[PDB]
Amino acid sequence: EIKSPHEQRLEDNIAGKEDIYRESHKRVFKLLERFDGQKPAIDVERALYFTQSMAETVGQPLVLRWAKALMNVAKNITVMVQDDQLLLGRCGGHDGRYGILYPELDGDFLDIAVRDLPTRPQSPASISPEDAKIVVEQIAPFWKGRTYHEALNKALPAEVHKLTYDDPDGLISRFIVNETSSFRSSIQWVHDYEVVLKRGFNGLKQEMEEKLAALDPASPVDQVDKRPFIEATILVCDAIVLWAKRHADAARKAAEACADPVRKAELIRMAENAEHVPANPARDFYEAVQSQYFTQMFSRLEQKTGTTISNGRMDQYFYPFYKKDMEAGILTDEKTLEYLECMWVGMAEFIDMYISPAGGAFNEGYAHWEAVTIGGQTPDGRDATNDLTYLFLKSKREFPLHYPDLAARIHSRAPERYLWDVAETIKFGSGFPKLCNDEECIPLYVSKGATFEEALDYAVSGCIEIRMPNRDTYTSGGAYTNFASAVEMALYDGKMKKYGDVQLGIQTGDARKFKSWDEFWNAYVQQHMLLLRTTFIQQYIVIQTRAKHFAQPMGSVLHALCRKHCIDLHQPQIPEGLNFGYFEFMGLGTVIDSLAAIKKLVFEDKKLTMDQLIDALEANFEGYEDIQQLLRTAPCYGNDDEYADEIGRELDRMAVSFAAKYGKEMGINNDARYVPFTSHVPFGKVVSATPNGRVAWFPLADGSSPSHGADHNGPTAILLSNHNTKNYGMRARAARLINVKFTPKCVEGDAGTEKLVQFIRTWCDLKLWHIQFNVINADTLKKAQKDPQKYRNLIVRIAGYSAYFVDLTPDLQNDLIARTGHDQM
């Protein structure tokens, strides 16, 4: 009926009109028009200079090798000044959208990427013949037998390898117990950006030089274990300062050749910035943005942080600079938005490239989660809403890209003006911001060793994870576990149709011969527990293997505990640190509804037999549409239906109870999480037809959202089912991703915004970690599917992030279309 602001801006763009927000954001609109929707190009510069150094330092301490390699990167990488930009900093020589390579992580995929990336279905990338030659002749040869993925592949035992990979080289995943440490250097992370703003890398280098001079020259521990770390942090401090100085030199060369006196003044000011920061503490808001921007951009050169390096509570640590400059009359809100959005433009040019097939399937639509945290509470416990908070919401509404990854913190005393503006930003229809509940994760974290000061100042990281940038020390990518495959294995005696006669799971027998609900439930529990055992065994190998392949000198020098004990973050145990790891429960809604359909329609109501059920499944419901339609009448997750929710609660109890028992012996919290990336698409592609009516190879239920079209009792019931399927008596849990879609008419006007605010307050009281919203009409998606070039600017909320709908595979588009769009609350 009515269109959201995004849909209206979409129609104006298609009709050829100027966007209504272009004039008051003219500079950044000029910037983003130069690359919007361009297929990103692979850049080889970082990997080349990184490889050149690593090849000459083999055998030395890993963290020192990393710093020497980053210095080689800083001296040689292309430094450029883009037109109209107010910021310096870039990770490649290509102009426009670009991604870089990390051969230390997944170098064994380099030949695969060279031939498959330009035409790959998920997030493709071009590679010029000049770039391909450098890759296959100068980058790939050194890394053969040396990459992390090869080490992980050869280190998994047979029974774990069979549930991890399909081929002996680990090049193709099976999407059963999926490792995620091979397509990202680490999980999400947030640097302590305020220590750079307040002390600069010159100050950190000074602190480390005092530690270097205090070492006992006779102590073998000081000289063998501590000294290489200290030398690495000192060298990496000089590396980033040299890198910034080269940008300052480039800005002055640009200034000498510029006829425009207004641009010449800007170029000189940019040069002055790079000559002060990040070496020295920032002195105004402009320098603070440029200082933070340099650090996060240099971080991308350091390692491929999961979901791309996140940014922390910008509306807090930028605020002293904003308030001082505003009151000094050297800044305005309009100038603030220009500085910040120049940072979004720069971030939007950097594409986080996943070159393996598994990594591409996990991150459709050039997925990115560089979380920017706003709102919430102060370290002392009062509300933290300020004028910068509202500007980020304003920037997100008017800036047309799906940047930044804006996350708003909610607590029980969040101001109404704040919740109102968040609700109105959500009603814009691009999926921003995502909500994180102080009330759920803060009590969990203080329970796991965090002080209240550390927990209250948490920053969202990645999808909806939280970080305490001077307390968190765990960086190992976790397992993603396909519990929907446990249902399939319980039907077919530990086998899956996708993999033929390969004995994947327990031989629980032919489900056609099962005589009671007890017998099928036991079969599932056996496969369920098997996936859990494989998950944790795989994880422990990942922890031990990553310690031999990854170092993070810059990230470590930004961590107070790493400076204090002189040890790199990617080591398994760091003194006084807290380790928050994860394993993923995938397919919750698909698993619940499948088991509920079997319990209800087979063994309680006797409405069909196991033969009818498995006959329909093995036929993919072809000729059996009556049984498919019958299966969809069983109780489902997401309706506040205790019949279904009690099954999900027990599924959760098994995973959380297992996590609490076996995490501690790995020395970490390895908690159950329900955050999917886009892995519910490839996980679905390996699972055949399921007892809930889902056809073969269709995506699974996303995160902890209800199965597609299974929520027939309104949106609030989704909140109650999430609450009813959790186990608040235990703590071995983490986030759950909730996706809810409203029609614009559902939330129309001031009456609609009020309904959404009360909905968010109910979501908060229920201690639910996360929630997201699409506000869109179904016909918008159907028109975008049929005519994708006309609707190429349509933006939809997927899983922690928004992306262009036409960049998504048909499978993921079908996930988006099949999600229930609620017309009333």
Residue numbers in the entry: 6 to 830
Pull verbatim passages from the article behind this deposition:
Desulfonation of isethionate by the bacterial glycyl radical enzyme (GRE) isethionate sulfite-lyase (IslA) generates sulfite, a substrate for respiration that in turn produces the disease-associated metabolite hydrogen sulfide. IslA belongs to the glycyl radical enzyme (GRE) superfamily, which performs diverse chemical reactions under anaerobic conditions (Backman et al., 2017). As is the case for the core architecture of all characterized GRE eliminases (Backman et al., 2017), IslA is dimeric with each monomer having a buried active site located centrally within a barrel comprised of two five-stranded half β barrels, anti-parallel to each other (β1–10), and surrounded by α helices. Gly805 and Cys468 are 5.2 Å from each other, competent for radical transfer from Gly805 to Cys468, and for the generation of a transient thiyl radical that initiates catalysis on the substrate.
After dialysis of the purified protein and increasing the isethionate concentration, a second IslA structure with the substrate Ise bound was obtained. In the active site of the second IslA structure, electron density was observed for the substrate Ise. A Glu residue (Glu470) hydrogen bonds with the hydroxyl group of Ise with an additional hydrogen bond being provided by the amide of Cys468. Several polar and electrostatic residues stabilize the negatively charged sulfonate group of Ise: Arg189 and Gln193 of β1, as well as Arg678 of β8, all of which are conserved in IslA homologs but not in other GREs according to sequence alignments performed using Clustal Omega. A water molecule that is present in all four molecules of the asymmetric unit provides another hydrogen bonding partner to the sulfonate group. The biggest rearrangement of a β strand in IslA is found in β6, which allows Ise to bind in a much higher up position in the active site than those of Hyp or choline in their respective enzymes (see above). To secure Ise in this “higher” substrate-binding position, Arg678 extends into the active site from a position on β8 too distant to interact with substrate in CutC and HypD.
